[PDB]
Amino acid sequence: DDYLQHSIVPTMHYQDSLPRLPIPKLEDTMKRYLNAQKPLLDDSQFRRTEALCKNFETGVGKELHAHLLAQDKQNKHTSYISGPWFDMYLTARDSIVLNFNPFMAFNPDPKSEYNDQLTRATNLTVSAVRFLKTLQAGLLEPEVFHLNPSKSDTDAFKRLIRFVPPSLSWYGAYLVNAYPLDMSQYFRLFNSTRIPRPNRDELFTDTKARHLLVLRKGHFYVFDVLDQDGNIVNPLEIQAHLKYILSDSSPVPEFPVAYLTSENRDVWAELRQKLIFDGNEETLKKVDSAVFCLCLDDFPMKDLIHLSHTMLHGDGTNRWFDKSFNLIVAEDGTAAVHFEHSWGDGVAVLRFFNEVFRDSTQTPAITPQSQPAATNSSASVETLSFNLSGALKAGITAAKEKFDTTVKTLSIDSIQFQRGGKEFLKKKQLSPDAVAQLAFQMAFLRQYGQTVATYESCSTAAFKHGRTETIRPASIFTKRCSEAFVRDPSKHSVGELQHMMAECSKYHGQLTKEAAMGQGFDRHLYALRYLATARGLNLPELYLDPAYQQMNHNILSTSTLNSPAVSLGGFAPVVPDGFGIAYAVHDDWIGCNVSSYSGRNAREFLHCVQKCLEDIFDALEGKAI
Numbered sequence: 122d123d124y125l126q127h128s129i130v131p132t133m134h135y136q137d138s139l140p141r142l143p144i145p146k147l148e149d150t151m152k153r154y155l156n157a158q159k160p161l162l163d164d165s166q167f168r169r170t171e172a173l174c175k176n177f178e179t180g181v182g183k184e185l186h187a188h189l190l191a192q193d194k195q196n197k198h199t200s201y202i203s204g205p206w207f208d209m210y211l212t213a214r215d216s217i218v219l220n221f222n223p224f225m226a227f228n229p230d231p232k233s234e235y236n237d238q239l240t241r242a243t244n245l246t247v248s249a250v251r252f253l254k255t256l257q258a259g260l261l262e263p264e265v266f267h268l269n270p271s272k273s274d275t276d277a278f279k280r281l282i283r284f285v286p287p288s289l290s291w292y293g294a295y296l297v298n299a300y301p302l303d304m305s306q307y308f309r310l311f312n313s314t315r316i317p318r319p320n321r322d323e324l325f326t327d328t329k330a331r332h333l334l335v336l337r338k339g340h341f342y343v344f345d346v347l348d349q350d351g352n353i354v355n356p357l358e359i360q361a362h363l364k365y366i367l368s369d370s371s372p373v374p375e376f377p378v379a380y381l382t383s384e385n386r387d388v389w390a391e392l393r394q395k396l397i398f399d400g401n402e403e404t405l406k407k408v409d410s411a412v413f414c415l416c417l418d419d420f421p422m423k424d425l426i427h428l429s430h431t432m433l434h435g436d437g438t439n440r441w442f443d444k445s446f447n448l449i450v451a452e453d454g455t456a457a458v459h460f461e462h463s464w465g466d467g468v469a470v471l472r473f474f475n476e477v478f479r480d481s482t483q484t485p486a487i488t489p490q491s492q493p494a495a496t497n498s499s500a501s502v503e504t505l506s507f508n509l510s511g512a513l514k515a516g517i518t519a520a521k522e523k524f525d526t527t528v529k530t531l532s533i534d535s536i537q538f539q540r541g542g543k544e545f546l547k548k549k550q551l552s553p554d555a556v557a558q559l560a561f562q563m564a565f566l567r568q569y570g571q572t573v574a575t576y577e578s579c580s581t582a583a584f585k586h587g588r589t590e591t592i593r594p595a596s597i598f599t600k601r602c603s604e605a606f607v608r609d610p611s612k613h614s615v616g617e618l619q620h621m622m623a624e625c626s627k628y629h630g631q632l633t634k635e636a637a638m639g640q641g642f643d644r645h646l647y648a649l650r651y652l653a654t655a656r657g658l659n660l661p662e663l664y665l666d667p668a669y670q671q672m673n674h675n676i677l678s679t680s681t682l683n684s685p686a687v688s689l690g691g692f693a694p695v696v697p698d699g700f701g702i703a704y705a706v707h708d709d710w711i712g713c714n715v716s717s718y719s720g721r722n723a724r725e726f727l728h729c730v731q732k733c734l735e736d737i738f739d740a741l742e743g744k745a746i
């Protein structure tokens with residue numbers, strides 16, 4: 122059949138009973154905020170911020186908090202952070218390219234000949250449509266985080282739980298230490314795009330649409346991947362239609378329209394309206410509502426750096442950046458999902474990513490020897506045409522110049538630390554995540570002699586309409602430990618170093634579990650600020666404090682996701698003087714892909730990460746510095 126999974130428990134079985142996202146006590150939030158400030162602020166800055174915190178907790182903050190709580194109790198179908206967080210993304214006027222959109226790259230099909238571009242484009246496309254089908258049918262297994270997978274990820278439990286009504290089903294999983302996740306974001310995975318508009322962009326979805334969008338050399342093509350009955354178009358036909366597209370000899374347009382999706386959101390909002398005025402509404406409608414955008418790149422990957430630039434931004438011509446996601450397949454079969462971040466988070470895209478990799482490699486629709494269906498692709502595949510006025514041509518030329526100049530300034534490079542990873546660190550009773558984050562802190566001290574604002578993404582999808590919370594890895598413990606390794610390495614015995622590292626690990630694990638439970642401080646303080654602005658009030662002084670602005674100017678911006686399906690991932694710095702650090706600690710090695718602009722040096726940082734990781738492993742192995 123056209124399904125890649127056959128869950129007996131409906132996909133959405135736990136959604137109705139998901140716990141609401143907790144609002145912390147204000148007292149806990151201000152304490153956590155100041156705790157994160159401790160490594161960043163000098164004595165007088167800290168005392169000044171401590172004083173604003175007290176004012177806030179006693180004054181306008183207490184009143185904003187009372188109102189946050191009452192609003193939440195009137196909207197128990199949702200989360201307090203959901204509206205504010207969507208608004209954070211959609212009101213942002215900066216380019217979504219680099220600023221917001223990340224990538225994750227698939228590992229190759231382990232069967233060598235399946236990495237042929239046509240074979241893999243077809244297999245990955247068909248598997249993505251099978252994911253859409255399985256989601257529609259409620260046949261995708263619910264997302265569930267198991268503490269004891271051997272007790273709860275069992276047919277035995279699944280047979281039982283399916284009889285528990287959705288109003289109670291979450292409780293049945295909770296009682297076996299399983300935690301069902303929110304899955305409401307999957308409503309925007311397919312047939313969805315972001316539409317640029319003044320003030321605040323729009324999330325658009327059209328579930329009726331049955332066609333794929335393909336970009337090749339900056340030309341736009343659409344064809345159906347679902348027939349009128351609701352079945353997947355025969356994969357041999359899809360193969361034919363893709364072969365047709367791959368055969369187009371037309372040069373890259375003089376005015377590649379995909380450049381516009383990289384503009385400032387107000388600029389693009391106005392140019393899109395001009396596109397409509399010039400009669401393009403039908404064309405844009407087909408782009409907007411396609412199942413997703415398949416991007417066929419006309420070159421192989423030179424190396425990991427090239428791959429990373431290719432999947433993060435490409436050259437500006439062959440990605441529709443607004444789309445829920447772009448599935449990119451290069452000439453050597455290298456594939457990635459580049460996604461728009463406003464509609465959903467890492468956990469939702471990763472499940473799609475994992476199922477698509479598993480299906481496309483284990484149950485490929487076609488083989489490198491399949492004969493495309495005898496079909497008249499020119500009748501089935503429409504080549505889209507945009508009517509561009511002079512103002513549109515000029516806007517595309519400007520979009521291109523701005524794209525080219527900015528991307529020019531972006532560097533990305535990687536390390537593969539091979540001495541060990543998760544196995545060895547867990548043996549030493551440490552959180553691998555904490556160790557990576559320590560290494561980043563220690564690296565930055567070694568390189569710049571500073572402790573700086575640090576961001577780690579944490580899913581709050583254990584709750585109804587959850588998104589993310591910020592883990593704040595820069596702690597007094599990481600700062601002390603880094604100082605010991607970097608500044609006075611002869612002052613401490615290996616036992617002392619190992620203990621310092623143990624205290625980093627514990628506090629990091631504590632922050633991680635708090636964040637996952639909604640007990641960070643970042644989202645809470647953000648929702649209070651949002652509430653004050655939405656009520657038409659002056660910004661409270663807490664938020665005007667340089668230290669608050671510093672806490673949210675994330676020089677070290679980090680994110681990890683791990684899966685056997687992901688070769689690597691990337692994102693650009695979130696600030697001009699920042700790094701963007703995609704990392705994974707695997708069973709036996711550690712990988713970091715780091716981006717930077719002109720204001721930072723990613724190569725040096727990575728040399729420092731390498732050195733710090735060597736120093737950390739040496740101390741852990743008993744060896745002296």
Ligand SMILES: COc1ccc(Cl)cc1S(=O)(=O)N1CCc2c(C)cc(C(=O)Nc3ccc(C(=O)O)cc3)cc21
Nearest residue numbers: 465466467468554578579580589633680681682683684
């Ligand atoms: C909690 O750990 C995990 C649990 C389940 C999985 Cl499938 C993967 C992981 S993980 O290996 O990818 N991982 C290691 C520790 C960790 C932590 C502390 C946080 C996250 C996480 O939430 N990451 C994340 C990344 C990006 C986003 C995003 O939306 O951008 C959101 C969350 C993953 C991981």
